[PDB]
Amino acid sequence: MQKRQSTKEEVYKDFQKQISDMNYYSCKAEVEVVGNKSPHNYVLIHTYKKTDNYKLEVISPKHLKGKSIEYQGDKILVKNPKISDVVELPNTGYLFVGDFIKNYLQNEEMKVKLSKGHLVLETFIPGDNKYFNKQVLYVNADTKNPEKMEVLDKEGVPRFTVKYKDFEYR
Amino acid sequence: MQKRQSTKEEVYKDFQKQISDMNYYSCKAEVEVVGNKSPHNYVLIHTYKKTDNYKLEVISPKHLKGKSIEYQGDKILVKNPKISDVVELPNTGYLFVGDFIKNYLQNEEMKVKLSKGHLVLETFIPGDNKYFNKQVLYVNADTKNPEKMEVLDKEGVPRFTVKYKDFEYR
Amino acid sequence: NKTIILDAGHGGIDPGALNKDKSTSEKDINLAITLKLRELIESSGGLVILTREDDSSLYKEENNKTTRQKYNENLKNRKEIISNSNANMFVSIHLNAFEQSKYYGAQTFYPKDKQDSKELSKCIQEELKRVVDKTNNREVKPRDDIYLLKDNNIPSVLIECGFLSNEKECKLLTDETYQEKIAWAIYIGIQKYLSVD
Amino acid sequence: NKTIILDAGHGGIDPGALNKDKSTSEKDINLAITLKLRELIESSGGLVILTREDDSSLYKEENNKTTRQKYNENLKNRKEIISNSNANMFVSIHLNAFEQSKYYGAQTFYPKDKQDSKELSKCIQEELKRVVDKTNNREVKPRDDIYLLKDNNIPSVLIECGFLSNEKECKLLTDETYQEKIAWAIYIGIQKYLSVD
Ligand SMILES: [Zn+2]
Ligand SMILES: [Zn+2]
């Protein structure tokens, strides 16, 4: 036997959940357009991807205040508003130091340690650069928000230290 | 009393879930950079939004084959590769006919009907354009994939009919 | 979500201008460019109102049969299509021809003293220059003698795509690929004009 | 994830070139532009190796004290910083000065017959033109007499940002905002060069 027929609202809410979680879709669209004369037909391909957008804007060192870098897709926007300059560059492919989603999400070979109220996550940085050797992220074990990140050289010295303040998300 | 301490893997998986569902985050980043001399300090604001990217490419009417429109952010890309032309236009704000996520997701005043194996969703198109009056989407009640969409004029005549073929999603 | 009137100037018994040897006419080229432009706009989610979809003229055979009367009735009927449509915009596609064969270039016109139409015309003229012929330095010109552009309440422009009087341009204008290029330029001009506000 | 050597040409007892009245020197302007550029690169996730961070020269007081010896030791020490760094790139910031005051403009150089460095130099020269002075039509020039650019195994360029010999340019070069503009141009040039491959 089989379950009972879904009601209007059950089917509708299932549809809402299905399209909300969608991160990619693709389809063929056959479109009929009817003006004041003969209809006309078109075929399109529709593609949807949900994509990441990162903006880093510098505030503190006065020289840099208001300068920004924006990562959108295959594109990067580098902005100096002090002279109204916008430069567009191609994205080859961590997108910046401080970028933690999708490297600490998409787990690989990785050291995980629970120490003094922090989830410590360590990965090696491929390319065996003497200076960008290992990436270490400290996550608050209660909030699960990142607290600190260190790029260590091959001798274990932090070359970049990011301290995350005022972290909010939706 | 209170629950037991989470293990390494429980905290780590909670963190993965939290950052995966993130659609927006914002924080202040205090960065220390240490070259071969004195360290230097910077303060940046990091902003992340997960954003929609739509591409419509025309295949069928030979004249239009390979022409495309891409919706990214505040930007729209209109491409005619037959002459290697790319035009960038500003996005003012359904993004195209056939766009159904985020209007049939974000419910408003809306007619929902369960008829002959289809979830029928009807909304009015604001602006009281004689020609773009009401938007009707037919969803397959089993797959929850959209099957058909009609833009009806004020007299109920379909002016645009989109039939969705080969629908796949992730 | 715009509705756009495209008017292929001429039709039926009314050819347009003609080439030197009268092989080639406005009717068919205007219709060709207009139908290319219709496809561009509709595939982008705009709705197109056509004055003509084929080689016909907007008059009925009552056998009064004055060619001037046929022409006048054609124009009145196109005007009523403009009046009764609730469209957002009107674009008329013609060609030019002068006794002097040295003249060439696409030229846009707008009805005198209508600012919106002047802006639209400028957008289209800029795209005609950039896409079709960077040589062309023509500027948009006002008109006050084109009936179909007078007093429409919507942005209204006429585009004379080239000169049949010019042999190189005439040969280009009979080419389906050149016609598509022109339609592309006009479509982009419309889109820029609409993106501003 | 690049590591970049920035070399503020001169320091300590070694000023660079001087203005007509010897008020203004290379040392301080080079250091200023280099530190602006350091901030641009580091805030973008690059690591900067400096030859000098302040007004000093890379030699030790052994009281042999030949000014030519001091200069030579300075150059050898900068060379060792290049050799031992495992950096991806080396950029040297200087200024020029000639007896003729009519000369002006930023000029980039690359070591003769090194293709990568020529490409980088071209990127920086294009940005110096576009950002700082559209008037400037200087082309990148090869050199084979700059020790610090010889045989480095990494892309290596020298930038002479302007002429102290030219009164208008000298006044500009002492301005912190103009210095930041130059740093911006160099930073963008580097970034374009790196975005290609
Ligand atoms: Zn005509
Ligand atoms: Zn020097």
Author numbering:
A (entry chain A), B (entry chain A): 22 to 114, 119 to 195
C (entry chain B), D (entry chain B): 40 to 236
Sentences from the study reporting this entry:
In C. difficile, MAL production depends on the CwlD amidase and its binding partner, the GerS lipoprotein. CwlD removes the peptide side chain from N-acetylmuramic acid (NAM) so that PdaA can deacetylate NAM and catalyze lactam ring formation to form MAL. Amidase_3 family members are Zn2+-dependent N-acetylmuramoyl amidases that use a Zn2+ ion as part of their catalytic mechanism.
GerS is largely anti-parallel beta sheet with the exception of an N-terminal alpha helix and forms a cupped hand-like shape similar to the LolA family of lipid-associated proteins. Thus, the likely biological assembly for the CwlD:GerS complex contains two molecules of GerS and two CwlD and is in agreement with both dynamic light scattering (DLS) data and size exclusion chromatography. The structure of CwlD is the mixed alpha-beta fold expected for the N-acetylmuramoyl-L-alanine amidase superfamily, with 3 conserved glutamate residues and 2 histidines coordinating the Zn2+ ion. While CwlD does not have an autoinhibitory helix, the N-terminus of a GerS symmetry molecule provides the additional liganding for the Zn2+. As this symmetry molecule is not one from the 2 GerS monomers used to bind CwlD, the interaction is not physiologically relevant. Importantly, the binding orientation for CwlD relative to GerS leaves the CwlD Zn2+-containing active site solvent accessible to substrate rather than at the complex interface. Alpha helix 1 (residues 65–82) and the C-terminal alpha helix (residues 217–235) of CwlD constitute the most significant interface with GerS contacting stands 2 through 6.
